[PDB]
Amino acid sequence: GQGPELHLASQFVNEACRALVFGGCVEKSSVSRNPEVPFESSAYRISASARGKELRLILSPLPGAQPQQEPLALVFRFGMSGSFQLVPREELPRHAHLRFYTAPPGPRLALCFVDIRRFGRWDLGGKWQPGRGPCVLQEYQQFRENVLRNLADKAFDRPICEALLDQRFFNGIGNYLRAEILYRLKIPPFEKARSVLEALQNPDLLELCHSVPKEVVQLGGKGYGSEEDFAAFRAWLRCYGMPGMSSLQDRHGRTIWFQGDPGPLA
DNA sequence: CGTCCAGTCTAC
DNA sequence: TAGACCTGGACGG
């Protein structure tokens, strides 16, 4: 997912796990080529927070949980299929690659990182990816100034629809969002990134990088609401994959949707 | 059946 | 920077 999806996953984990207590190890699937999670505790709480296209879990042991241990942080990137589900222990989904198990008393559940295509990754540190810009959702001012302050970067030589996927500057923006953001302002996709941004030294392209993802979060759904959780989202799209929209391929063969003028660098 | 389509991460 | 990395759904013979 993109920014809003990671945000909604974080919200789901905090809400679902709020009154749960986990115990045991953190079981990785043998099939998953991500790291073993070396954590085990008689009783620990799980919480989440998001930043752009990253999600941090914190495993926090209870007072007197054994063994004595500091809380452990994990950072996930979801790839294309990543997600969290809370299921009964005995009905793990296909492709649950990392599982955390509730501790009795009560229904024996499993919080699962589910990732069909296995593009999602997790790291033991708790650190955000160095290089990643500030979050378009929760760090708008930082995000905005990081762009305007660095227009001389080679990244802004690229056309705008290519620049918007640079997670050094648009941490959280992915394919549907660049399409929907550009369509709101009718900015040609293959306009030169530096040229579109020097025009602002009216909601503008950088406000919309904040406000458009925020519209998706405020919708809810996407597996964290209530596959009809996607009804609203499908109806909310104005561009991405819509009848009578144009669509090219950027230099990395990613599909950009737009109306009218492709712009000078197609 | 068959083929094509849907964000990094790292080796060249 | 391409290509590699993966599964399943959507769409066509």
Strand B and A2 CB separated by under 7 Å: yes
Cβ A101 vs Cβ A36: under 8 Å: no
Q: Is the domain of A110 the same as that of A142?
A: no
Q: Is the domain of A140 the same as that of A104?
A: no
Distance A230 CA to B1 C1' (A): 30
Domain-ending residue, one of A132, A162, A185: A132
Q: Is the domain of A137 the same as that of A252?
A: yes
- The tokens for A154 are 């080679």
Distance A10 CA to B11 C1' (A): 33
Strand B and A168 CB separated by under 7 Å: no
Q: What technique determined this structure? A: X-ray
Cβ A219 vs Cβ A232: under 8 Å: yes
What resolution in angstroms does the PDB record give?
A: 2.8
Task: Give the orientation angle of helix A3-16 with respect to helix A205-219, to 10 degrees.
Answer: 40
Q: Is residue A201 part of a domain?
A: yes
- The tokens for A253 are 């063969």
Strand B and A81 CB separated by under 7 Å: no
Nucleotide with smallest C1' distance to residue A172 CA: B7
**CA-CA-CA-CA torsion sign (A54, A223, A29, A42):** positive
Distance A234 CA to C13 C1' (A): 29
Domain-ending residue, one of A132, A155, A170: A132
Q: Is the domain of A70 the same as that of A88?
A: yes
**What residues make up the domain containing A49?**
1-132
Domain-ending residue, one of A89, A117, A132: A132
Distance A38 CA to B7 C1' (A): 27
CA distance A216 to A28: 31
Domain count, chain A: 2
